[PDB]
Homo-oligomer: A and B are copies of this chain.
């Protein structure tokens, strides 16, 4: 079958033929849908073959010339050595494809413009740090943010793995107390205690940038203090609520995911940090207002003199909107690239139209594409979507312990 997909705002119908290529199976069955869940050897040749075929199709060079050629070297490389190395442009093409294939990413209209830094020859934690440091300064670019990914060595058997122990390159500390509850970011309480365990004297702040626990193969991690002028941060203020700045809230410029695993042609890169620029709801709605994160919503509503005594005043909704307004205002005044959820979702709709004519569909995870505020005010809410796994891909992986 080819799933019929409807856009209810316009009445248009498309068929997702690309879904028929679904490689890895997801968590749903005819009996029950698990779509809402956050976390659901010489067959290596099979996935290497298919990825190489993808490469030469994308350059109008299938069934000719070096296509058959490159098929044989990987045949020989694996027959001889048991794995294989990717050609330079393949690593590039595979990095962009895995972004293109990320079902939960609303920012994919940008997928063709990605800076791929090849770090496959890295071989120490001090080396990672300067690779990571080049990435951060390139991507930050004085606030004119540029998408980038650094690709550390591809895992091989019988020997350890490169891993960044932090979930992101920039994280804020979270400290327990004489009463349990957390000062700082609660999402990072764990890595905060691992950084304390391995040295790092704890600060006493709600926005202390954590160090970096970087791990070379078969070696215990090594702490690396991040250069303060390399971590671009934005103090948060509101255009008309003058007291908002006095709340002392801040967030960082660069969203750099450093705990996911990049998988290209059967190869596995457990260290491949990728970075883009923020959508404002990630900071304003999820990071600052989630009950298990900074959870500032009631505090902002107190300052706004809102009626927190009744849910039907919609005090939560009014304060959340103003927090998002402050995020967008602050980043724009700081000249730091950011995108609001209306602009982001409109571009994703254009991306769906592109991917329809280009590939016959697009894997999209509705629950992650629709923003966490104002869902039905964005066009993606009214768009039916089909979720499935394509390769190359970014995958979650276990914490390195």
Contacts and interface: CB of A to CB of B under 8 A. Distances in A.
A36 interface: yes
Interface stretch (A62-70, A140-148, A212-220, A377-385): A377-385
Contact of A30 (B3, B29, B291, B381): B29
Interface in A3-20: 3, 5-6, 8-11, 16, 19
Contacts of A290: 9, 376, 382
Interface stretch (A104-112, A203-211, A314-322): A314-322
A372 B381 contact: yes
A25 B30 contact: yes
Interface in A371-395: 371-377, 379, 381-382, 384-388
Interface string A165-196: 00000000000000000000000000000000
Interface stretch (A118-126, A150-158, A324-332, A349-357): A324-332
Contact of A292 (B9, B27, B316): B9
Contact of A35 (B8, B33, B311, B316): B33
A349 B285 CA distance: 21
A14 to B, nearest CB: 13
Interface residues of A, number: 67
Contacts of A385: 36
A104 to B, nearest CB: 12
Contacts of A5: 37
A162 to B, nearest CB: 29
B22 A31 contact: yes
A151 B318 CA distance: 42
Nearest to A281: B376
A79 interface: no
A19 to B, nearest CB: 4
Contacts of A6: 37-38
30 contacts: A5-B37, A9-B291, A26-B31, A28-B30, A32-B386, A33-B33, A33-B34, A34-B386, A35-B366, A35-B387, A36-B385, A36-B386, A38-B384, A290-B382, A292-B382, A312-B328, A314-B321, A314-B342, A316-B374, A316-B377, A317-B373, A320-B374, A367-B370, A370-B375, A371-B375, A372-B375, A372-B376, A372-B381, A373-B374, A374-B374
Interface of A: 3, 5-6, 8-11, 16, 19, 22, 25-38, 280, 285-286, 289-292, 297, 311-314, 316-318, 320-321, 324-325, 328, 332, 340, 342-343, 346, 366-367, 370-377, 379, 381-382, 384-388
